[PDB]
Write a protein that binds this DNA or RNA. Sequence first.
RNA 1: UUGACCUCAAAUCAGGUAGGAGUACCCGCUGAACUUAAGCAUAUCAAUAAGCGGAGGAAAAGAAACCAACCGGGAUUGCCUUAGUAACGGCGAGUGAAGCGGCAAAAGCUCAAAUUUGAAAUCUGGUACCUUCGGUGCCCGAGUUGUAAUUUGGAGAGGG
RNA 2: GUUCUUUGUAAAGUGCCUUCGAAGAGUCGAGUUGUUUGGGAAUGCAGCUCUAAGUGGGUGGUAAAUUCCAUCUAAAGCUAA
RNA 3: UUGACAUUGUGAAGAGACAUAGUUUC
Lengths: 203, 99, 51, 148, 193
Amino acid sequence: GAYKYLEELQRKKQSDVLRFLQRVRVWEYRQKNVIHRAARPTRPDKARRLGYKAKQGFVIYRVRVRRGNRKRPVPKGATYGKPTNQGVNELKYQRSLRATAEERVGRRAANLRVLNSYWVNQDSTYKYFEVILVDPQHKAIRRDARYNWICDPVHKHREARGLTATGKKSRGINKGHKFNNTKAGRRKTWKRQNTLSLWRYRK
Amino acid sequence: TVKTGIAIGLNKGKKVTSMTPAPKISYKKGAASNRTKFVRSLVREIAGLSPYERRLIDLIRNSGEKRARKVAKKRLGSFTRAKAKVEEMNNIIAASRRH
Amino acid sequence: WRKWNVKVNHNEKRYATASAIAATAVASLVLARGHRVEKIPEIPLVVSTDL
Amino acid sequence: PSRFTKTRKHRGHVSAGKGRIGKHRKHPGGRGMAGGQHHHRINMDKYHPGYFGKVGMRYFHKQQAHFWKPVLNLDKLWTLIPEDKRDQYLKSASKETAPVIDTLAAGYGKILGKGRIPNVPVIVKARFVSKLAEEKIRAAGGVVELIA
Amino acid sequence: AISKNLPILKNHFRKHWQERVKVHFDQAGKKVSRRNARATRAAKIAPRPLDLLRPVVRAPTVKYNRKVRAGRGFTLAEVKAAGLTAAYARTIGIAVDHRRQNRNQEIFDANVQRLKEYQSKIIVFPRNGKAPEAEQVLSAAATFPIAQPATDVEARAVQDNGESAFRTLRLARSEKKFRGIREKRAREKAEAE
RNA sequence: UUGACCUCAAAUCAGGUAGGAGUACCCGCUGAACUUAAGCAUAUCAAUAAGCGGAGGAAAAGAAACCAACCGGGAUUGCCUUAGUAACGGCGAGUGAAGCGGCAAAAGCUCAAAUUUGAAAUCUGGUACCUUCGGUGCCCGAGUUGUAAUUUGGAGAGGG
RNA sequence: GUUCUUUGUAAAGUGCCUUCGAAGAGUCGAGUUGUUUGGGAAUGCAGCUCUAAGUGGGUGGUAAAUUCCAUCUAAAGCUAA
RNA sequence: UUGACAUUGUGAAGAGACAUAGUUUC
Ligand SMILES: [Mg+2]
Ligand SMILES: [Mg+2]
Ligand SMILES: [Mg+2]
Ligand SMILES: [Mg+2]
Ligand SMILES: [Mg+2]
Ligand SMILES: [Mg+2]
Ligand SMILES: [Mg+2]
Ligand SMILES: [Mg+2]
Ligand SMILES: [Mg+2]
Ligand SMILES: [Mg+2]
Ligand SMILES: [Mg+2]
Ligand SMILES: [Mg+2]
Ligand SMILES: [Mg+2]
Ligand SMILES: [Mg+2]
Ligand SMILES: [Mg+2]
Ligand SMILES: [Mg+2]
Ligand SMILES: [Mg+2]
Ligand SMILES: [Mg+2]
Ligand SMILES: [Mg+2]
Ligand SMILES: [Mg+2]
Ligand SMILES: [Mg+2]
Ligand SMILES: [Mg+2]
Ligand SMILES: [Mg+2]
Ligand SMILES: [Mg+2]
Ligand SMILES: [Mg+2]
Ligand SMILES: [Mg+2]
Ligand SMILES: [Mg+2]
Ligand SMILES: [Mg+2]
Ligand SMILES: [Mg+2]
Ligand SMILES: [Mg+2]
Ligand SMILES: [Mg+2]
Ligand SMILES: [Mg+2]
Ligand SMILES: [Mg+2]
Ligand SMILES: [Mg+2]
Ligand SMILES: [Mg+2]
Ligand SMILES: [Mg+2]
Ligand SMILES: [Mg+2]
Ligand SMILES: [Mg+2]
Ligand SMILES: [Mg+2]
Ligand SMILES: [Mg+2]
Ligand SMILES: [Mg+2]
Ligand SMILES: [Mg+2]
Ligand SMILES: [Mg+2]
Ligand SMILES: [Mg+2]
Ligand SMILES: [Mg+2]
Ligand SMILES: [Mg+2]
Ligand SMILES: [Mg+2]
Ligand SMILES: [Mg+2]
Ligand SMILES: [Mg+2]
Ligand SMILES: [Mg+2]
Ligand SMILES: [Mg+2]
Ligand SMILES: [Mg+2]
Ligand SMILES: [Mg+2]
């Protein structure tokens, strides 16, 4: 199959043929609207290991988001409290640009369900992503044992809740000593270790 | 191994009649394979070398194999990868512009 | 979260119930407790399993 | 119960037992463990010498268990044998048929030597021993058998 | 705020802790609830028991390896030896664990024996639907308990080879302690030009 | 001249879908100061309040890129414990988890990466009929820039 | 429990021999900045710059070079109590 | 405000090295 070649070819992003390619595409996308419907995946090998399928009900969307830090809003940089909180300008934002990308298209296609998304390009100002989506009212999907899970209401806006692959990353859901803090879900486990538990027969 | 049967020292621990289990194929998640070998070989020669890889084989020729690692170490993650990277360019060099 | 229940040592607990069982003999005690047992055959008053 | 509580006894007196002059105010000392090195130092040194500063080495990710190793003294030792079974061994201090005692099985890690076992053979299976315990054990015709 | 000869305390109540007090008034309730669930599962689950066959397993770490404990499931090995595939064993009320491994023969056999007893002490009804009602034993756990293996005998002959336990410990600890130094002396002298 | 294709549009085009509300509990973002330190800035209050986006009857987590260092264990969640401990800390005030053990409940799995290539074997829709949460015939259409079968690392595949 | 159609020149399970055994990239990882954490020469998260490999890769709670060993199999997914 | 790196590509003359072939850098 050709997908193995595509996969390998794509890890050579500074190879000559690839940065010609990167160069021409990144100008074209940037011309088009910030969110625009993609006609087909430009990385079909990436799409398809990430859940995509060539049948009606599957959708691709290309979106770009600004790069760099999060400038803390606040009029004139004024912070009105303690010095530890006086920063404004080296402040970073706990979600990935990919998450912003997912969220902004998911909103644009609220009949759809975000399934996953993948990086395709960047310059100094934007990162470019394609988001692979599924339409859970499409009968082709509503059948399909493998995908129709996406049809249940627990999966409305997974991107808004940190349940897509990026989201699970940033929430830091992983097994181990490295993830004690966030893992069962950080606020949840905080609440746990900070709940006072009293028995009828006091222990 | 064999454990000594006491509670300190070299092969500290309980003596148990041993078994050694069938190998797990997870444990071979790294192995090459003919298909990958072929495809990677082919891609390489399709697409050529990246900028830092070129700066690399120059240094190897013109400054030795130790300055090469030092730069490659800064470029890549770390030292072990630079080891393998220099090592790889070394064999591009041999295989090609030589024997 | 006021303390509503109370722990009692299981053994001290039994000491008590035993003491109480013991005292259900002792007619004076049963009399003093209310309980109209002057006209009963004997104490402990044991009746047939037919009950 | 409130019934037996001194505040019942203080109703009708002005200051509730807390003084007309000194009063009962919110936090004169400061709060909690404040003043430690200043207005509360006489009480800290004295009653708590050792409080401030550091000693030895930090140990990151210390797993208590590593060091699990309860001690049992010869003191006892025979208690690890059930008493009915026990009287039988005392009488017939004997090679060829001496009691086995798996101290690890009983949940001890080391045997120590507090004091005088009878002059009767024991076979003692343990992970560690003090030099002494083994000595005393041996002087009764017994051995330590090192397990794990 | 420091006075008398009192021990120094650490009562962590500086957050809005009253917003997070769970007092289990529902102990008795949950118990009832919990029991009802079991009566229900039992009834739904026809003659099956309420649990799966679990293997013996020696527990981890220096502290508990004395004891033996119910495992998760049975290792692809143990099942194979007991004359059945795992896909079936799963439908017969036996837990199987693809990630446990056999390094210990004594435990391995124990687990194979556990399986032969189970197989012999169950009956498995024909798929058809003849359903020859057979009364449920509720606990695979109670039916096939797990005992600690007897490791010796009460009494025995004393043998004293002479060389003491204490010094062996000491020496044993020592050899390890200097194992590398001694090797560096072995290396450094190997380069005897 | 006629017919495709790619990309892009338009219909009050055939059928659908999102918005708002609620918000105890839940998944995220963003984010204080009062306060405590007997002053105070790091610290603390607090990864709390207020502000924002998103779900359900629970949610989230989940079949190990885990824990261990044992004679090893074996998805996740919770309780008892670990422990006011290891550790963090103007090492001040203060803070502070995890592995083992017992217990509640238990359950396991599918994709991607493979030539069906002696036969796209797959699917939306329209339509006619029927025994209508659906089936069948037919016709447009999707789809080879890959829709089915097969395989998921515990394995597994091809020949014998 | 009953009854009606056999779904099949269908589908699945197991033993031996041989050859194979594809396994997720602007990711892992690294520097730095900021935040956060009990996590201490850096616990997680994120920004910018660098950016892998395949007997490889991650982890092994003191930075580093060397040599081993142990243990999982990331960067895709569903799931009752 | 100032520097570096990324956005960043293509020729030409002149400098800069393996130390008076052209890969590389100003
Ligand atoms: Mg389309
Ligand atoms: Mg403020
Ligand atoms: Mg700060
Ligand atoms: Mg630009
Ligand atoms: Mg924490
Ligand atoms: Mg109490
Ligand atoms: Mg009181
Ligand atoms: Mg009272
Ligand atoms: Mg009174
Ligand atoms: Mg008075
Ligand atoms: Mg008086
Ligand atoms: Mg009075
Ligand atoms: Mg008075
Ligand atoms: Mg008073
Ligand atoms: Mg007064
Ligand atoms: Mg005064
Ligand atoms: Mg007071
Ligand atoms: Mg202190
Ligand atoms: Mg004592
Ligand atoms: Mg508390
Ligand atoms: Mg407070
Ligand atoms: Mg309640
Ligand atoms: Mg149960
Ligand atoms: Mg039946
Ligand atoms: Mg219409
Ligand atoms: Mg809403
Ligand atoms: Mg805050
Ligand atoms: Mg307050
Ligand atoms: Mg103050
Ligand atoms: Mg004050
Ligand atoms: Mg003030
Ligand atoms: Mg803080
Ligand atoms: Mg709020
Ligand atoms: Mg609802
Ligand atoms: Mg449900
Ligand atoms: Mg429930
Ligand atoms: Mg769920
Ligand atoms: Mg797995
Ligand atoms: Mg577990
Ligand atoms: Mg100080
Ligand atoms: Mg303190
Ligand atoms: Mg805190
Ligand atoms: Mg348990
Ligand atoms: Mg299942
Ligand atoms: Mg993988
Ligand atoms: Mg930092
Ligand atoms: Mg923040
Ligand atoms: Mg940090
Ligand atoms: Mg190292
Ligand atoms: Mg293991
Ligand atoms: Mg999937
Ligand atoms: Mg899920
Ligand atoms: Mg400039």
